Symmetry: C3
Subunit: 118 residues, 3 copies
């Protein structure tokens, strides 16, 4: 669930989800070219993870509500039996954590239409 | 199995399992508050891993014996078919390795009853 | 399969597959003793991964063709339904990445018959 992903982002990081709305070539809806940096790389992975989520029966990355807990700054995906829930929570936990450890290059905000994402 | 987690600890790390019995808010039985450091986080994760293991048919974190090998300092989980054995060996390997890479803040030994695990 | 692992290496790293053909105690066929360094550990792990892959029905590490994409330097395993394909692509992607982040100690090329791999 996207609303759970948004909360996981501020759980694990200092920056919120809005910070990543327009970053690099892959953070946001869509992606072209090669990821410009580690952060963009994070979004690249998460992006493929969601894509893959569809391959799971009754699994929609945006709809699916899973189980998780946040112990600022720790995220725990508690689902075991529900494979779709488990898979999806992992994608998001991965991204949130990746987003936090990665540096934020403001130099790479709004480069989408540049020769950077060709 | 717990005796296996113990050996994994000294396999991958320098410090033995006794070193962690009294660390931070989550190393050892129970756990409350925010983990104080990376090591305590390691214990926090491992702790939730065991809890998640119960959700596996015929799976008890303490008595379940799996297959693993130690080529000090390397740990290899051999189980593939046995989902419980596999899951558990992984929990432990994750922790044993995490413990090894994590710094040991002696300042964080015996703080469980302090305002830090509040 | 092996041709896909070879290409994954060039994808994720600077050095190609031939670079590791003769490295440490585990890179290349066989392997005995303690991995001498980070990179060697990589091969050690990957090697155990291929071994474990045989425990999957209709799964041969060298023959199995999986689905993956490379966006230098990024690798994505796209398999979800095909457990064997998925497992194997992971082994390789893991190795390719481990190989790229690990330092290359030319001092550890051709030491297989020395006292170091005992």
């Amino acid at each position: 669930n996207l609303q759970q992903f948004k909360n996981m982002i501020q759980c694990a990081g200092t920056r919120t989800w809005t910070a990543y709305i327009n970053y690099g070539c892959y953070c946001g809806k869509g992606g072209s070219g090669t990821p410009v940096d580690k952060l963009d790389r994070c979004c690249y992975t998460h992006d493929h993870c969601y894509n893959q989520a569809d391959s799971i029966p009754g699994c929609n990355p945006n709809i699916k509500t899973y189980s998780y807990t946040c112990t600022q700054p720790n995220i725990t995906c508690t689902r075991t039996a529900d494979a779709c829930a488990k898979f999806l929570c992992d994608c998001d936990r991965t991204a949130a954590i990746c987003f936090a450890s990665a540096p934020y290059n403001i130099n790479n905000i709004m480069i989408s239409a540049s020769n950077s994402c060709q």
